[PDB]
């Protein structure tokens, strides 16, 4: 219930796309590199979290409210800012992806 709408809202912002190009802006969120792979994200970003992450949380009853989603999408989208340059093409998705779940946040609560 709570879990579900959760839920929605994650699938739905997973599943956006740009308009034009159609392309999933989610994308390269979805699943960070591992710490082997990239080790420069753990040492620099203190709580690191990508979308499955917070499928996750979400299916293990980790947020009390939608607030608490909102926290940890908006956490990820500030890591990523942090992480990448601003001026790429990934730190700009980041950007985009905080309105894109309020919006979807908002047509679902509604
Ligand atoms: O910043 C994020 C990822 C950045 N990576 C993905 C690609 C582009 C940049 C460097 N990348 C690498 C680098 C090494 C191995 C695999 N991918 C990121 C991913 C998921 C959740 C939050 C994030 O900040
Ligand atoms: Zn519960």
Redesign the pocket.
């Known amino acids: 219930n709570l879990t579900k709408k959760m839920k929605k809202i994650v699938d739905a912002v997973i599943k956006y796309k740009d308009s034009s190009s159609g392309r999933q802006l989610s994308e ?2 979805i ?3 591992s710490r082997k ?2 080790p420069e ?1 753990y040492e620099l970003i203190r709580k ?3 979308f499955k992450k917070i499928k996750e949380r979400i299916r293990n009853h980790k947020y009390r409210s939608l607030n608490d989603l909102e926290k940890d999408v908006m956490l ?1 989208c500030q ?2 800012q942090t ?2 340059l601003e001026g790429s093409l ?1 730190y700009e998705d ?1 950007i985009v992806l905080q309105s894109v779940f309020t919006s979807v946040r908002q047509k679902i609560e509604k």
């Open positions: 390269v969120f699943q960070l590199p792979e990239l994200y690191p979290v990508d990820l890591n990523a992480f990448n990934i980041s």
